[PDB]
């Protein structure tokens, strides 16, 4: 009913977009002050990697349950409860005594639990208020808040820490705006209507689809590399710059760089695939594979330039991020091309789960574990801390090359999978 939509849809879209910005502003505030967290709690590289692994595991487990409860109960109540759920906990976790490291890990788990609800439920509301023509534009406006919040995380954390003089203050700002958004959503968002079944046949059919499996494994590789680098880059840059005796501007510059690479990579990928589709019908997997194999080379050069000059490292980071973030708007098309319309709702929900299981659930912890394992076998000094983190961070190009190989294997079966899908659909109806 447009009669109330004339105000409700605009107000809801704006407030939910700001909610998404606040949602992503609180995942990367800890990555900005990881060095201070380590120096205060007195821990090592093994335990400083749990603070993102626990978050990701909790998000993994708690997303499908909220995705199910979102179509039995009132959605505004759940969104409001989650908002404060992830807010109040974030605020309360800044008073922890020095002897209680594990309590911070528990806090991060609870924050992840709340963010799962928000990020699973909000798109459904923002997509049930609009018709066939303007749903896509509003969804894009919702989605184009990931890079902005991601950069604002580093920038806010570093700036507040430097200005206040105590790292605790980095965790005491976003709850104030969360407590406002969680009240404004109760006012500006109109109520939206809600809504033996077997999903074993869906699984049994999806397992024998080679393109689907290979694309899922490639997405897992992308998640691995993205999580590891996004958590462990700024600390490595700081250590390297300390080694040269030429030095928190690193977080500022990294946030500024990612805020632009996020848009640039997606635009480049979309243009390239639109050009390529008119030459051959294997365009999407080949474009993705070329992107991965061209991003691995520029990723691998950070660890060589960082020993001699910093500006080269920044340029390599720019190019690597730009090429790596050029296959986030293509994989959904590969999924839609070879999966019949009745099995898509399952085939997405499964894939996301897998993308978190083989990907960024255990990657930062693995990097920290390998770093300490290498570190304990040699002398203790800043130079070996730098070289240890550098040598640990070399597993990412290997995984990226594996992802490229999987995209090629997808391009190998793309056409046969399409033909089978068409025969299935025309036999159903």
């Amino acid at each position, epitope marked *: 009913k447009p009669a109330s939509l004339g105000r409700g849809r605009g107000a809801a879209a704006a407030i939910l977009s700001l909610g998404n910005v606040l949602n992503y502003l609180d995942r990367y505030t800890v990555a900005g002050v990881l060095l201070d967290i380590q120096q205060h709690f007195g821990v090592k590289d093994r335990g400083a990697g749990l603070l993102q692994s626990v978050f990701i595991c909790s998000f993994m487990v708690a997303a499908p349950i909220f995705g199910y409860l979102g179509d039995r109960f009132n959605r505004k109540v759940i969104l409001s409860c989650g908002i404060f759920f992830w807010s109040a906990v974030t605020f309360s976790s800044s008073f922890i005594p020095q002897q209680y490291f594990w309590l911070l890990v528990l806090s991060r788990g609870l924050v992840g639990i709340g963010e799962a609800s928000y990020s699973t439920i909000a798109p459904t509301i923002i997509g049930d208020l609009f018709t*066939k023509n303007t749903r896509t534009l509003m969804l894009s406006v919702f989605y184009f808040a990931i890079p902005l919040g991601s950069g604002l995380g580093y920038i806010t954390g570093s700036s507040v820490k430097q200005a206040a003089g105590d790292w605790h203050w980095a965790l005491r700002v976003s709850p104030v705006l969360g407590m406002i958004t969680g009240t404004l959503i109760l006012i500006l968002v109109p109520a939206t209507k809600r809504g033996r079944t077997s999903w074993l046949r869906d699984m049994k059919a999806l397992i024998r689809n080679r393109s689907y499996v290979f694309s899922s494994l490639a997405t897992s590789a992308v998640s691995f590399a993205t999580g590891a680098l996004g958590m462990w880059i700024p600390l490595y840059l700081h250590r390297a710059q300390v080694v040269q005796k030429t030095a928190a501007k690193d977080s500022l510059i990294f946030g500024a760089i990612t805020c632009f690479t996020g848009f640039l990579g997606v635009v480049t990928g979309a243009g390239a695939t639109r050009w390529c589709r*008119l*030459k051959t*019908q294997r*365009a999407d997997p080949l474009v993705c594979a070329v992107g991965m194999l061209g991003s691995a080379i520029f990723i691998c050069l950070i660890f060589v330039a960082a020993k001699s000059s910093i500006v080269g490292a920044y340029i390599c980071i720019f190019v690597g991020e730009t090429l790596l973030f050029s296959n986030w708007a293509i994989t959904a098309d590969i999924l839609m091309y070879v999966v*019949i319309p009745t099995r898509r709702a399952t085939a997405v929900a499964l894939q996301s789960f897998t993308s978190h299981l083989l990907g960024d659930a255990g990657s930062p912890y693995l990097i920290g574990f390998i770093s300490d394992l290498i570190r304990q076998s040699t002398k203790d000094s800043p130079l070996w801390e730098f070289l240890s983190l550098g040598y640990a961070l070399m597993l990412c190009p290997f995984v990226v090359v594996l992802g490229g190989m999987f995209f090629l294997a997808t391009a190998l079966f793309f056409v046969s999978d*399409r033909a089978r899908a*068409e*025969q299935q659909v025309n036999q159903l109806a």
Partner: nanobody
Amino acid sequence: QLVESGGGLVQPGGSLRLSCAAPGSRRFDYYTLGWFRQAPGKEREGVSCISTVGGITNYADSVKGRFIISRDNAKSTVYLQMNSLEPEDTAVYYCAAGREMCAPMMLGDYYDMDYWGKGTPVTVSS
């Protein structure tokens, strides 16, 4: 864009053969077929479509048994063969290029085609 051809003035009981072609070196293998039509006092509706790989055809309910669509990939052309025309077939006919699988109950939706033509009028006399 795509370029249409054919169409004219036909008497009742006649036949006519329309064609769409791609310009330049574009190939349009990924997917580019489906014929639509529009009348002076009605809305745009779908008439037929064919599939990318196997050659599977679907027609609307009111044209079954009369029209026949075909695809030729060596020349990048699509043909429609129209038989036993009636005074209710006066309209302007279009080609389109989209991405959704060829199936029934997919025809009538035309908000998700990527490429459109300009149309060629067909007038059935009396």
